[PDB]
RNA sequence: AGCUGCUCCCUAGCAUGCUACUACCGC
RNA sequence: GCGGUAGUAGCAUGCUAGGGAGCAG
């Protein structure tokens, strides 16, 4: 810190003492500049001490309040960041059993229960259109979760059982399309 | 944490004594605090004297001491003026540009929206400043409408008329449908659901929204919603494209919109066009012929 | 590879829990059970099948708009 | 006494709240954990000392990215910190030598 | 520290110093105006620095007693709350059956784990599964603690009302199953 | 939403102590 | 030329108080 007013007075006193010691004339005339220069570092290191601590005071307070602002802005967005992070990890995971059901849900095949894992036990998969039917169900076998299921109880949305052979392209616009195709694992 | 009103510089300071508590940058916030009576500023923490039992609310009297903001006599020996360099202490300190002409936004902040010149200011100042003029205008008068008396019914004379008492201290609002009341049924627990009525003098004739039977002692209020600051300006900038982009013209047209078709030829080629809408010339005919010209 | 499964199971149960799934006691019991089996698993295959069984719970719901959050 | 390395790594990864998914806000917990996970540095098993070294490098990255973030939000940096001792082993070595300096 | 008897005296001493320094008459004048600034400095040493400490002391005392006043207000509030809780919960217990059960004790001291047993006006059962339900709360009425209770308002974990016909054997796996049956004391 | 115990970091205060500069006093 | 006292600044140690976080039972 050199841009303070007392630095100029200290510099003048230092120049005076440099001239005195370069001339080396008196004993008391230079001693004046130990009663006027040794003071010159009393209103200098008193004014240049408090300001230097004030600088770090301001810095510490600013850092504290910046951290508080970040803490208030983070805990108010968790239920978007959690989902983003989850899906990034999932696409990093790279497992076909997952990608199959993720794509299927991205176009509509949302299961209506927990996908069972036993060789027995029931599954129900909504199918809202026909092009979706083309990829998943072929004949009697249901392909989902990279597994082989058996088709048993196709039904329309008005709770009327619809037979399997009926399902075709021309007669497709004759059914309540949100089918619920119950099946069992291999 | 965002951008101030005039400068749009990233900031963290919000004027406490101001109507709608907007963001202000350090120099910009100081310019407001000295050019208004709005002497309260509210950053990520409140700028008040945190020593016990103090009442000072102006920022100039405040000084920083340790981990707080202190008044004149409550400070420790180590202190620092919050109001220095014409910019009050705040986050995003250097990244403040200040506004050359602040007195407009000082006037809006000190405005009571009483005279026509208030509205002239509300529409003459700049883009987000005039959006804020609308914000403050509305905010003021919803703080106004509930400062009137409550329409407490006293007697049930007959259908379509009642007797109305009003609370002592605050006046009676005008007797038209301009001030739409809303009622709730007072019970042993709370007040619930009458509906929106408007009252005129009989006796007090009540125009109710729905059919309903009232009793003695039920009262209605002029409710307000929670008014939350907009995002976009009043309307997007104008841009005249070469051709009708993004739209597919029709094949043939009916007669009753011919004078309209040679109109939609141009609203389709740029984005917006103000329509001199003289009363009852086929205005909603104009509206439907847009779809007749472009069905999809 | 398995560590990815454990971490993503933790994240999945976090998002499910904040999705107000704990208001259906049997559903929450199943989810918690599956979580604890995944965390205590020692081989990668049963971890993956319990993983897809757990993911099906979130997929069945209609709160997480999927076509958006998979913007790639 | 050295701890169980899985315990240290699990404390590193799994936390509560949301404050601690961001190292900058905390830092100090990494200092304490590196203090606790020091004696693994003298373990003949290779994959134990790397935990301590990872913690040191992570503290360094945390500090010199916090300084950058504060520099880009504001326009000056932490005029003086004397924080280098945190990412050097001399600080942590002091706590297992018989001369108390409380 | 500007309105003390010493600011005037130091100002007068320095005024004489500057006036006679501009005059600059004798070396003894400089000695006198130095030995005047070197004594009137003691005046501004204690008159404006020990009183600078009394302010710190007085402020410390004032805040301490402010804190103690708040301490003694919170006590009144907690006392009022506790006494109100006592006097409002007492109102539910004093049935006549309590008098009948206490007046018949040899002394008047009855055990605590028999007061709700022979006086409570409402029972709460919690059943983990249907098997335990069948041996405890089957039907609309059941007997516990040598009394007769009648069932109403059966609920489950999600606290939704469940009618009595639903709990069969085959329907059981479709219910949240810490079922909490509450019953009234029939007479 | 418990009882301890150890350790790090920040700030405040008092006291102590140390050192430096200035003033007064005689010797 | 010494001593002492009064001041001011800087430094250290320690004790108390307040806040944050981590480990062990
Ligand atoms: Zn304002
Ligand atoms: Zn601004
Ligand atoms: Zn104060």
From Swiss-Prot, chain C:
Residues 1-72 form the RdRp Nsp7 cofactor domain. It is found in: Host cytoplasm, Host perinuclear region; Host cytoplasm; Host endoplasmic reticulum. Interacts with nsp8 and nsp12 to form the replication-transcription complex (RTC): nsp12, nsp7, two subunits of nsp8, and up to two subunits of nsp13. Eight copies of nsp7 and eight copies of nsp8 assemble to form a heterohexadecamer dsRNA-encircling ring structure. Plays a role in viral RNA synthesis. Forms a hexadecamer with nsp8 (8 subunits of each) that may participate in viral replication by acting as a primase. Alternatively, may synthesize substantially longer products than oligonucleotide primers. This is Non-structural protein 7. It comes from Severe acute respiratory syndrome coronavirus 2 (2019-nCoV).
UniProtKB/Swiss-Prot annotation, chain E:
It comes from the Viruses. LRR repeats lie at residues 30-57. Changing residue 113 to S: In strain: Omicron/BA.2.75. Residues 1-73 are annotated as: Disordered. It is found in: Host cytoplasm, Host perinuclear region; Host cytoplasm; Host endoplasmic reticulum. Residues 1-187 form the RdRp Nsp8 cofactor domain. Interacts with nsp7, nsp13 and nsp12 to form the replication-transcription complex (RTC): nsp12, nsp7, two subunits of nsp8, and up to two subunits of nsp13. Eight copies of nsp7 and eight copies of nsp8 assemble to form a heterohexadecamer dsRNA-encircling ring structure. Plays a role in viral RNA synthesis. Forms a hexadecamer with nsp7 (8 subunits of each) that may participate in viral replication by acting as a primase. Alternatively, may synthesize substantially longer products than oligonucleotide primers. Interacts with ribosome signal recognition particle RNA (SRP). Together with NSP9, suppress protein integration into the cell membrane, thereby disrupting host immune defenses. This is Non-structural protein 8. The lineage of its organism: Viruses, Riboviria, Orthornavirae, Pisuviricota, Pisoniviricetes. The chain holds residues 3948 to 4134 of 7096 of the full protein.
């Amino acid at each position: 810190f050199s841009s303070l007013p007392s630095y100029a007075a200290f510099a003048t006193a230092q120049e005076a003492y440099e001239q005195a010691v370069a001339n080396g004339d008196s004993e008391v005339v230079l001693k004046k500049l130990k009663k006027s220069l040794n003071v010159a570092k009393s209103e200098f290191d008193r004014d240049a001490a408090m300001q230097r601590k004030l600088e770090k005071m301001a810095d510490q307070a600013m850092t504290q309040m910046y951290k508080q602002a970040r803490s208030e802005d983070k805990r108010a967005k968790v239920t978007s960041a959690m989902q983003t992070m989850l899906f990034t990890m999932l696409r990093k995971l790279d497992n076909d059993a997952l990608n199959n059901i993720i794509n299927n849900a991205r176009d509509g095949c949302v299961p209506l229960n927990i996908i069972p894992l036993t060789t027995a036990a029931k599954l129900m998969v909504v199918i809202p259109d026909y092009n979706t039917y083309k990829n998943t169900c072929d004949g009697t076998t249901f392909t989902y979760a990279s597994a082989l299921w058996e088709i048993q109880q196709v039904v329309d949305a008005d709770s009327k059982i619809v037979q399997l052979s009926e399902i075709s392209m021309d007669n497709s616009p004759n059914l309540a399309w949100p089918l619920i195709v119950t099946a069992l694992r291999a | 944490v965002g951008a101030c009103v005039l400068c749009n510089s990233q900031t963290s300071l919000r004027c406490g004594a101001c109507i709608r508590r907007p963001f202000l940058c350090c120099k910009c916030c100081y310019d407001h605090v000295i050019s208004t009576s709005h002497k309260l500023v509210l950053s990520v923490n409140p700028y008040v004297c945190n020593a016990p039992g103090c009442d000072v609310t102006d920022v100039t009297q405040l000084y920083l001491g340790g981990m707080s903001y202190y008044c004149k006599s409550h400070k420790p020996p180590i202190s620092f003026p919050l109001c220095a360099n014409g910019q009050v202490f705040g986050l995003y300190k250097n990244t403040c540009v200040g506004s050359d002409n602040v007195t407009d936004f000082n006037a809006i902040a000190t405005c009571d929206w009483t005279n026509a010149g208030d509205y002239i200011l509300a529409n003459t100042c700049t883009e987000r400043l005039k959006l804020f003029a609308a914000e403050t205008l509305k905010a003021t008068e919803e703080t106004f409408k509930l400062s009137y008396g409550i329409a407490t019914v006293r007697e049930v004379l007959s259908d379509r008329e009642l007797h109305l008492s009003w609370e002592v201290g605050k006046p009676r609002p005008p007797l038209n449908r301009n001030y739409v009341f809303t009622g709730y049924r007072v019970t042993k627990n709370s007040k619930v659901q009458i509906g929106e009525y408007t009252f005129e003098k009989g006796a007090v004739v009540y125009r109710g929204t729905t059919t309903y039977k009232l009793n003695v002692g039920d009262y209605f209020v002029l409710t307000s919603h929670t008014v939350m600051p907009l995002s976009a300006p009043t309307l997007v900038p104008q841009e005249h494209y070469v051709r009708i982009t993004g739209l597919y013209p029709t094949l043939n047209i009916s007669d009753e919109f011919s004078s309209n078709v040679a109109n939609y030829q141009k609203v389709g080629m740029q984005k917006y066009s103000t329509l001199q809408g003289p009363p009852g010339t086929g205005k909603s005919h104009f509206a439907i012929g847009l779809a007749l010209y472009y069905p999809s | 590879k398995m560590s990815d499964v454990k971490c993503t199971s933790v994240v999945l149960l976090s998002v499910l829990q904040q999705l107000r799934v704990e208001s259906s006691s049997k559903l929450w019991a199943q989810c918690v059970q599956l979580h604890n089996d995944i965390l205590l698993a020692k081989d990668t295959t049963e971890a993956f099948e319990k993983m897809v069984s757990l993911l099906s719970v979130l997929l069945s719901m209609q709160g997480a708009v999927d076509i958006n959050k998979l913007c790639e | 006494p050295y701890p169980d390395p899985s315990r240290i790594l699990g404390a590193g990864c799994f936390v509560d709240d949301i404050v601690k998914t961001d190292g900058t806000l905390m830092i100090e917990r990494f200092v304490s954990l590196a203090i606790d996970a020091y004696p693994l540095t003298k373990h003949p098993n290779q994959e134990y000392a790397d935990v301590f070294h990872l913690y040191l490098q992570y503290i360094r990255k945390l500090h010199d990215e916090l300084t950058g973030h504060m520099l880009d939000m504001y326009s000056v940096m932490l005029t003086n910190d004397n924080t280098s001792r945190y990412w050097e082993p001399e600080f942590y070595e002091a706590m297992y030598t018989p001369h108390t300096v409380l």
